[PDB]
Structures are given as C-alpha cells and as structure tokens.
C-alpha cells in the first residue's frame, strides 16, 4: 500500500547511509592510538564535600569562573556553592520540588532549573535588593524538563520528555525555535563550544546534531542499545560522547558521522547517568548507577581511575572550565570536588 | 581587604544554614505520596474528596501529607517515575483488558530497582461498578482470567453482610492477582496494602494514614533489626 512504499523508501536510505559510513571506516580509532603512551593510573582524591542538600541531587553545573557552582536537589532548593571555601552563596527555594536540571549562565548573573513542572524557571542572581527572585518562567513544553543550557543572558536551550528541544527568548518568554525529530524522551543536551550547534540524547537510543540558527537536525547518530542518559561535546567541537542504560559509553565523530569508540567492561552492567571530558579531552569521566565514577582513556578505551566516594547513585558530574577539578553529585545529597 | 571579604562570606553562609534548619524540620515532618492511576481508574474523584504535576495537601491527626499526581506527562513513565523513589508510599488506583494493563504496570513498579524500597497502597476502586456487573452475569471474568473459574474465596476474607458470594469471590480474586505479584519479591523491604475502595468513600484518607503509620512503624523496626 501507500504505507509500504514510504516505509521501504525510508529503508533504502538507511542502507545508503550505512554503506556511506562503512566506506569512511577505513581504520578504527583504537588502531590509530595503539602507539601512544597510556595515561597510567589516575588517582583523584576528594578535596571538598558540599553538605546541605536535604534530598537526592539531580543536577549540577559549574560557573565559568571555575569556582562557583549550582546544584539542584528534589527537596526544592537551588544552592550556589563557593567550591574553594565550601560556603553557600545562595539558597533558592523552588516552587516545584521535582527539579531535574539546573544551569549556570556564562555571565554568572542568572541560573535556571526545571523538572516535572514542565517549566524552565530563570532566577536573577544580581538583584538590586540582594535577594534572588524569579525573573522568567518559560512554559510551553508538554513534558518534564530534563536539561537546560544558557547560550547567553537572553537565550537558553531546553530538552524535555515531550521528545522535543526548544530555543527560548528569555526577554519575551516565547519559543523562538522548536527542535523535533526524536521519538523518545530527550534526556540531555550539550552545546558546541562556539554555540552554533548542539547535540541531544534521547530514550530512542539515538543522538542528534541540531543547528541553532536554522532549527533543523543535521545528523542522527545511532549505535546505543538503550536510552541515552547523558551527552557531552569533545572540547574541539568535532566529537561528542554519550552514556546510556546499556552500560556503555560511546564516542561519535561529527565529520565522520559514525561511532569511533565504545567504553565498556564486563563488570559494568549498570547505566551511565553523566559524562564529561577533561580539559584536553584525553579523559572521559562517567557517572554510573553503581555509585561510582569511572575515568576512561578517551583515546585508548582503557579505564584509568575510579571515583568511588559516593554512597548512592551518581546523578551528575561536571568539569570546571579551567580543568582544575571535577564535581560529582549523587542521590546521597552530597556534592564532592575531586582533584 | 582579605579578611573582610571572607568575613562577609561566613556571615552569609550563617544566614543560609539557619534557614536550612527550619526547612529541614518541615521537610522531614511532611510525608510525600505519589498518586498513580489510569485515565478511568477513579483517582480524579479521590483527589476531589481530598501543568506537569499537581499537588494536594491534607492533614490527618496533626500529620501533614503532600500528595502528587502526574498531569501533562506522556504515558512513557520509565524515566520520570524514578523521581519518586523516596516517597512514603505510592497510591495505585485500579478500576475493578484494562485490568491486565494495571497488573503489568504494578509489576513494573513493584520490580523497578529504584522503587524496590517503596511500599504501594493499592486502591481497588469501582467496587460498586464491579458488583453490578457480577450480579448481571453478562460479562464473565473467566473469559479474561481463566484461573478464576477454579478460584475459591479465601477463609481470611471479611466481606460485607449484604454481599453475595459471587461479588465476594470476584473482588477477592482481583486482589489476589496483585498480591501474587507483591509477595513474589521484595524480601521484606516494601509491602502492599490493598483496600476495596470507592471514589466517594470517606475512609480513603484514613486508610492512607493508617498504611503510612504501618509503613513508618516497620521502617523503625527495620532500623533496630527487630523485624
């Protein structure tokens, strides 16, 4: 029928894409990096333990100054920490306690958060009176807010369980652009360094590269077996890593348009909740459901170290802009700084 | 001016920690509940008896309860349901094959690794609707549940005086359908509290209070290795 024609027409294109990707796969990354020296044993120690959250922590984000950071807990609080002195700078009560994401504006003047309320709330940190208050509530998503990232003080990109991503104008509060194409809940997004593109991972076991200016999906990446819970751009903007419930991390190249490396082990059978690269991109850090964080050699797919100082599920992790430290959040209501 | 800079930080951190102590007492005093149910299970009427998520507050015997119901969320629950791993109990409302779909959802909730320590308060709703269909006899449960034709009403059953054995055996069979799932696993970390309820019944709020008391009592007994 008419459905069979279009379904087969889509099937012919998937073979053409798979054949074109196979032609470019002349040699694998594991063979090109076979002659480089290994990073050895990476031994990081807990330098700071941030206490004060009442319930499980769902997200965190470093500030561009590599000193301040914001964390979101399902007790209904955003806490901004001074990681150097462990002092709390702000404690923001949330209208909805079921927060699932938080973001720190690059200027440092705003923070955002959202969750099961399907709203991305913007908070002004530089109020004249000195008390943080809601600056804008971004409504329009028909599903929970899973991730948000500021492009600037006026623009922010969000991902939602409604299978779509959106670009918002904070001053007007309207969706400037809506990114559609995913068939499952979008769980995470990561902005390119130049903020021209961004990648998103979803519960359809696929990752998509989006153009911010045009609003279309440039490329779609597959290879994972289950839902993608985390995504992070390589520092050069030409690659990105993903973490999935299939207990594996994978590295994808934009210009090659295919997976380059898989980071897995037989002992690991739990899903990955968060991923982040070191400053040089040599180290790929990943949080796991087994309460531990693994440090992978991004070039050689070998595990280099473990961050095992958490008593519950690691829900988020982040590397500072200067690359000096790594922060880990967990369901044990604590944030730890590793160095 | 190095000392004055760090001095204001310690003073600002002091005001924050003082506020966090007041919020800690309120957060630990409130018992949070997740209300789950089908579109036609009758849970909407129970909220009437007392956006992505709705909130309902009610107090029983000086105890505060915060009940949450999912609003504008897709039917794919495997991600957002993890946010409710720390609730006191999940209130699962079931209209007494829509019944098989509720059994499958209950099995996934009961066996989810993050919900393993979460007890479930099961509301077998639509008991008056269930009674009318059994008295008529047009639609037989045996067609959708073949093991019902060999089912026998348990001895520990406690039916109403004005109830025929056809309705007593029908509602208790549905209860055993869920109890088989709940007693198959758990190893004593969470429990299931089934209740034959109606949307207009006033004991519903009292039933949640009694089950929550039983949940907290068994949690204390577990902390002392007594049960």
């Amino acid at each position, epitope marked *: 029928s008419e459905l069979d024609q279009l379904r087969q027409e889509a099937e012919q294109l998937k073979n053409q894409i798979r054949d074109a990707r196979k032609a470019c796969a002349d040699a694998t990354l594991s063979q090109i990096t076979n002659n480089i020296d290994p990073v050895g044993r990476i031994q990081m120690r807990t330098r700071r333990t941030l206490r004060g959250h009442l319930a499980k922590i769902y997200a965190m984000h470093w500030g561009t100054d590599s000193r301040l950071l914001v964390s979101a807990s399902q007790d209904g609080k955003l806490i901004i920490w001074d990681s150097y002195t462990t002092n709390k700078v702000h404690a923001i009560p949330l209208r909805s306690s079921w927060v699932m994401t938080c973001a720190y504006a690059p200027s440092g003047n705003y923070v955002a958060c959202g969750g099961l309320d399907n709203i991305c709330s913007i908070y002004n940190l530089k109020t004249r009176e000195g008390n943080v208050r809601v600056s804008r509530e971004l409504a329009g998503h028909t599903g929970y807010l899973s991730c948000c990232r500021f492009l600037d003080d006026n623009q922010i990109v969000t991902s939602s369980g409604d299978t779509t991503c959106a670009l918002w104008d904070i001053e007007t509060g309207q969706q400037t652009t809506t990114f559609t194409g995913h068939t*499952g809940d979008v769980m995470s997004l990561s902005l390119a360094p130049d903020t021209r593109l961004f990648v998103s991972g979803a519960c359809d*076991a696929s990752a998509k590269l989006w153009d911010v200016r045009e609003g279309m999906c440039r490329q779609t990446f597959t*290879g994972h077996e289950s839902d993608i819970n985390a995504i992070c751009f390589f520092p050069n903007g030409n690659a990105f890593a993903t973490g999935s419930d299939d207990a594996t991390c994978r590295l994808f190249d934009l210009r090659a348009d295919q997976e380059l490396m898989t980071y897995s082990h037989d002992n690991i*059978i739990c899903g990955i909740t968060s991923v982040s690269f070191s400053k040089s991109g040599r180290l790929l850090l990943a949080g796991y459901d087994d309460f531990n964080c693994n440090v992978w050699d991004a070039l050689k797919a070998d595990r280099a170290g473990v961050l095992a100082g958490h008593d519950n599920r690691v829900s988020c992790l982040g590397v500072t802009d200067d690359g000096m430290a790594v922060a880990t959040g967990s369901w044990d209501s604590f944030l730890k700084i590793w160095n | 001016d190095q000392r004055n800079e760090e001095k204001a930080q310690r003073e600002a951190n002091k005001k924050i920690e003082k506020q966090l102590q007041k919020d800690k007492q309120v957060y630990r005093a409130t018992h949070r509940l997740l209300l789950l149910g089908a579109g036609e299970s009758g849970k909407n009427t129970i909220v009437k008896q007392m956006s992505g998520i709705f909130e309902t507050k009610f107090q029983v015997d000086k105890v505060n309860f915060h009940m949450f119901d999912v609003g504008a969320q897709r*039917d794919e629950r495997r991600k957002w349901i993890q946010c409710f791993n720390d609730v006191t109990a999940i209130i699962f409302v079931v209209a007494s*094959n829509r019944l*098989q779909a509720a059994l499958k959802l209950f099995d996934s909730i009961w066996n989810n690794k993050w919900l393993r320590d979460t007890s479930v308060i099961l509301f077998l709703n639509k008991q008056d609707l269930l009674a009318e269909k059994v008295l008529a006899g047009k639609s037989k449960i045996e067609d959708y549940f073949p093991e019902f034709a060999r089912y026998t009403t348990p001895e520990d059953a406690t039916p109403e005086p004005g109830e025929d054995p056809r309705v007593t055996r029908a509602k208790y069979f549905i209860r055993d359908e869920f109890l088989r799932i709940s007693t198959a696993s758990g190893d004593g970390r969470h429990y299931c509290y089934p209740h034959f309820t109606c949307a207009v019944d006033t004991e519903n709020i009292r039933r949640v209070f009694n089950d929550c008391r039983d949940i907290i009592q068994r949690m204390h007994l577990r902390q002392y290795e007594l049960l």
Partner: nanobody
Amino acid sequence: QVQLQESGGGLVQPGGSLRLSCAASGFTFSNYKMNWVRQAPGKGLEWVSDISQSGASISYTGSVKGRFTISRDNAKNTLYLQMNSLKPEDTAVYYCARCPAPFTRDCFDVTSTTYAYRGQGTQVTVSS
C-alpha cells in the same frame, strides 16, 4: 540501530494455526526480556505475552492462555509466537516489543503508543 522486524501473519480461517517470527538486531538479544503486543482495530495496544532472557519465565494474557506459545532463540536472535485455535477476536496487528533496559525485572512502556523499541507489526486477520 535497534531494529525489530516481524514476519508471518495474514488471513486464516477461524480455528487454524499461525506462527509469527521476530528477527532482532542492533542489540544483545540475550540480555533483554521480550514481549508480544497487539492492537485490535479501533482498540488500543494490549500486552499479549512475554519471555525472560533465558526463556525460563513465561507469562501470557488470560485470553490466549492455552492457545498461544511464546519462544525465543538467543543464538539466532529470534522471537516466536505460536498461535493455535485462532478466534476472530485475535484479529490485530501484532508487534514485537523489547524491554527498554537490559538485566531488569521491570518492563516499562512496552504498550505505549510511541515506544521506540518495538517493531512495525504484522497484520493477523482471522475471518471466514
């Protein structure tokens, strides 16, 4: 990518037999619990049967107990459904549905209208 492709089905007289096949690819078949679901004309998706990873735990919906037989072959990465004594109410589009996560007892969202890890279905029509 994860791909599920069902085969078999068609027109069969009432009381006949039918065997469905589900060829899986793009994932470790042996690590996932498999399901069969169907959508009757005008009705919503409903769960039919499931089978554990090793094939030890097997369940059925009440309407097909004693008439449907589910089986899997992890070596060939295939899922089977042996339909015997078919009735007109069995007329539906049967889908091969994989549980979302491996090494899990729970199996969420397999009957959702937009579930990703589900095949395109095969039409089974039982009529005289």
